[PDB]
Amino acid sequence: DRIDSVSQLQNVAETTKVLFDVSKETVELESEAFELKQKVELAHEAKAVLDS
Amino acid sequence: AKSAANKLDWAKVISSLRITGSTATQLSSFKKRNDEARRQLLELQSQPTEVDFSHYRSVLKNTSVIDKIESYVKQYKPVKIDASKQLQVIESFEKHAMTNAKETESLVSKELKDLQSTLDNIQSARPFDELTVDDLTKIKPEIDAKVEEMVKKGKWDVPGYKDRFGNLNVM
Amino acid sequence: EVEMRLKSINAIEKITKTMKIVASTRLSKAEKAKISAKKMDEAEQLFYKNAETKNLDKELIVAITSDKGLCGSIHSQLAKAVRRHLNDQPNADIVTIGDKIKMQLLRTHPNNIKLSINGIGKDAPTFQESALIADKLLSVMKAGTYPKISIFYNDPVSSLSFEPSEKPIFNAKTIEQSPSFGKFEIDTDANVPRDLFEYTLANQMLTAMAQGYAAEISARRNAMDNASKNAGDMINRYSILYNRTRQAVITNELVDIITGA
Amino acid sequence: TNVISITDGQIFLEAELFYKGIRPAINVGLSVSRVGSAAQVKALKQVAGSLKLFLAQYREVAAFAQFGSDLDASTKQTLVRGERL
Amino acid sequence: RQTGKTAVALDTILNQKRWNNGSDESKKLYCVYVAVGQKRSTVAQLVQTLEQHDAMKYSIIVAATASEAAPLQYLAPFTAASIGEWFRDNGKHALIVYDDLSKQAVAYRQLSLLLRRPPGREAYPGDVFYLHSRLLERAAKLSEKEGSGSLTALPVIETQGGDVSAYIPTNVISITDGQIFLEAELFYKGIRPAINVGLSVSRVGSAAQVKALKQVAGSLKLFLAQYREVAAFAQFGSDLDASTKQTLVRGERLTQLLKQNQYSPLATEEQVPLIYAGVNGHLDGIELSRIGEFESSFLSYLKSNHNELLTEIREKGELSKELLASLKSATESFVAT
Ligand SMILES: Nc1ncnc2c1ncn2[C@@H]1O[C@H](COP(=O)(O)OP(=O)(O)O)[C@@H](O)[C@H]1O
Numbered sequence A: 001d002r003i004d005s006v007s008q009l010q011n012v013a014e015t016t017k018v019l020f021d022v023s024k025e026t027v028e029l030e031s032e033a034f035e036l037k038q039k040v041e042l043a044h045e046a047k048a049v050l051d052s
Numbered sequence B: 001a002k003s004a005a006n007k008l009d010w011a012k013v014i015s016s017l018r019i020t021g022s023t024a025t026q027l028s029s030f031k032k033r034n035d036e037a038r039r040q041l042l043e044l045q046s047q048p049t050e051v052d053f054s055h056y057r058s059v060l061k062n063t064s065v066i067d068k069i070e071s072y073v074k075q076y077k078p079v080k081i082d083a084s085k086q087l088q089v090i091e092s093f094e095k096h097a098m099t100n101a102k103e104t105e106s107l108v109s110k111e112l113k114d115l116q117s118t119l120d121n122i123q124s125a126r127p128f129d130e131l132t133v134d135d136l137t138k139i140k141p142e143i144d145a146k147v148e149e150m151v152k153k154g155k156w157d158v159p160g161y162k163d164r165f166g167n168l169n170v171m
Numbered sequence C: 001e002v003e004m005r006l007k008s009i010n011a012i013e014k015i016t017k018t019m020k021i022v023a024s025t026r027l028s029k030a031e032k033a034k035i036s037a038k039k040m041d042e043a044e045q046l047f048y049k050n051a052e053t054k055n056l057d058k059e060l061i062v063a064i065t066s067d068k069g070l071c072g073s074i075h076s077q078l079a080k081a082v083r084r085h086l087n088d089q090p091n092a093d094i095v096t097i098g099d100k101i102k103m104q105l106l107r108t109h110p111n112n113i114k115l116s117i118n119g120i121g122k123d124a125p126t127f128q129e130s131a132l133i134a135d136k137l138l139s140v141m142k143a144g145t146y147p148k149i150s151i152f153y154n155d156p157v158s159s160l161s162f163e164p165s166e167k168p169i170f171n172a173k174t175i176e177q178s179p180s181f182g183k184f185e186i187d188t189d190a191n192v193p194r195d196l197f198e199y200t201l202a203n204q205m206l207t208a209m210a211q212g213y214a215a216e217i218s219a220r221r222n223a224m225d226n227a228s229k230n231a232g233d234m235i236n237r238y239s240i241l242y243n244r245t246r247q248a249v250i251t252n253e254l255v256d257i258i259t260g261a
Numbered sequence D: 001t002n003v004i005s006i007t008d009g010q011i012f013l014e015a016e017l018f019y020k021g022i023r024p025a026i027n028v029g030l031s032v033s034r035v036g037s038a039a040q041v042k043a044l045k046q047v048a049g050s051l052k053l054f055l056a057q058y059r060e061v062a063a064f065a066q067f068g069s070d071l072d073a074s075t076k077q078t079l080v081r082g083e084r085l
Numbered sequence E: 001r002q003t004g005k006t007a008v009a010l011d012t013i014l015n016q017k018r019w020n021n022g023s024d025e026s027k028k029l030y031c032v033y034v035a036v037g038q039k040r041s042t043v044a045q046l047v048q049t050l051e052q053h054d055a056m057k058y059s060i061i062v063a064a065t066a067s068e069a070a071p072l073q074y075l076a077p078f079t080a081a082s083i084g085e086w087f088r089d090n091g092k093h094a095l096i097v098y099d100d101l102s103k104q105a106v107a108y109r110q111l112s113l114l115l116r117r118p119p120g121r122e123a124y125p126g127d128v129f130y131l132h133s134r135l136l137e138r139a140a141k142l143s144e145k146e147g148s149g150s151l152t153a154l155p156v157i158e159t160q161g162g163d164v165s166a167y168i169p170t171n172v173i174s175i176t177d178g179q180i181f182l183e184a185e186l187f188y189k190g191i192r193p194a195i196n197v198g199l200s201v202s203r204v205g206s207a208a209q210v211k212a213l214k215q216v217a218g219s220l221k222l223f224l225a226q227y228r229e230v231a232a233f234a235q236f237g238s239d240l241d242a243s244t245k246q247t248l249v250r251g252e253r254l255t256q257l258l259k260q261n262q263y264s265p266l267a268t269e270e271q272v273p274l275i276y277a278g279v280n281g282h283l284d285g286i287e288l289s290r291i292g293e294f295e296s297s298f299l300s301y302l303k304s305n306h307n308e309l310l311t312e313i314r315e316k317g318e319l320s321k322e323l324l325a326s327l328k329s330a331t332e333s334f335v336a337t
């Protein structure tokens, strides 16, 4: 029981590393999303005054 | 690139055996999920930065404002410099990540080898019927200390002696 | 809806009322029998709390119910109680008395059940049949082997609410020795351990079956009262509908007379 | 419907309490006086305020007739007061 | 009234945008609305909602409000039918929704009362059935010789008290190719679509569908009707029924599945997995209360990390052995969540 409880952290360590770095980088690169979102809002405002 | 990341993240989520009892990694999971949702929303709802004066300017006759808005968008596209500076605390976290992760991989590997050796020499040899008490004494000396401690305290019937063995109280 | 109204008024309302009435007439007699047997049951329980005969440390399940066909919720309640008890321990020889409880036990744990008795809930309980059933149960099943015997029987508080009250059964093993068996003088040559074990197996089961019959017919009265209320409100709404439809006939004849003529 | 619209409130009567035994078969639930309170002798007006809630509660909890023995003490008291009234 | 007939009509009109926003004219559905007997404020709000979702570009709102006279109400659906045939006779596909034909029928009543045409039945002139016949039978799918045009019709009737046995109901249920029942009790219960599966029939059962949905639920309506009957039977007497019935459990889970919010057009690709999970008995251990969350979770699962088979179904318009196997994989991988 000790053997098959321990025998899990062999091929999952790389998955944990890659998921950690990917999730952290995706969370912290939200600056691009914020810039695109504000550009979209301002373009929408310009189009809005256009149809107004 | 996002497809493989989603595959591995979901596989890790569904294959959690000793990765349960978590409080914040799931929070980061929903953070990434809503970030991707915002990405998709921005791509599907991409408004047109420049004014489509090719087909829209003809609609207005007395505009008096299309030049002003055109100039305002022309001067607004460089909103500011993108941060792209995820290299001061994220990098340190990651460095510690691989360092102690390799440490843990090494320790679990050697623990697995030790357990395999224990099973091998438990089941492959060492018969018990012909085992001698002297072998047990030389293997581990704490039994001698136990004998000292219950002789000095004078309790020869410590609980847990013959419950699992044969008392055979004939008389 | 004339046939529907007729079958509502004279086929599910008035005869259900009179069947509730005969259920209440049976309820009076069964209440008299229940209090009569509860006299010795109270005597036995007060004696047993005076002389603690609790059994320490092969199980028996006795399903005691009348022959009524699931009168609303008493049979479902007993079935869920025995289901929970089986979940606690599914290694007992279940004995079922009745028909609805018998098929409930068949559909729940057919393997565990090994004895069924029919033709019991015909009328108010009789002592001879209960004692013969106890003799058969202690002979073919040997209830003495099982330290604990469980008897299932519903208990109405005053009229409506019912609970699956269970009374422990004391075997000869827990009578020959007990925490307070020395209070009461006994005769070793008289074999009073086994005698008291059989006596309690008889009295407790007999009064349990009497109380189960009383609770079954009380729940029958409650279920037929609920059916009577359903018939009454269905009849009220459908009589409003009948009046509406028959007045609509008058509206139709009005419109075709003022259009045609 | 025309008559109830022109009239300032109505007092419904039904033959069903007329047959059960309540010959003055005045039901409060459908009867209403829009100016009755302003034109009622003061004694009954002040005392009839408690009557309305009592009989309304009795009539709404009247669905389970042969069930209040073990349903609730408050429901049993409401039934008792309602049939007394 | 106020059961969702106009709601489902507008959801269909909005959903047609995804197909009329392209270039393939064989799949575009140029909608045309018939807001007959509708107050001008309501039709103004309706057109406002249409252009809010960019649906006004393909929708015609030819109608006669309650302000104008009865003949306007009588003729507006017929001229909408004329526009529909023009779209149909040109090889194009048009969806027409005759919203609340009841005011059209009573407008014809108003014409006939003082035009010296005696009423036929129930104060209705006899020709109401004929007018419904000529108006709705113009809606048809043309053959390849005539241009393969389609004139899909969505008639709407406002019944009183759910009386589908009244005259105007009887004629229009006999004039149409199936019906969609929207009882008031289901709307008041909480089901916004409020559609009764038992009576809502059609002539395109497992036909004239995408194909992915037609294989999954080609006969699910009969199963749901039998579920309703057994559930009524289950409450009748205590027997081997209720949660112990796999058919009852599957039917209740599917009925809870079939729900929708207004102004939320859902594409055909994000509809097969839910029904497939319902029909194939994969919802036994998901509970009725949790099915609402299960729908959103399953849709997010497909649209986030299982878009392969979803897009394959969308582009193919059919689920094959490979697609069926992939959908089975997804559904019993996500059944644990
Ligand atoms: N999710 C929903 N689905 C459908 N209708 C909704 C929903 N939420 C709210 N409603 C309300 O239901 C009403 C639908 O009425 P409608 O069917 O247009 O009336 P009618 O049947 O007379 O045309 C709307 O006014 C809307 O406010």
Ligand SMILES: [Mg+2]
Pocket: E006, E038
């Ligand atoms: Mg409407």
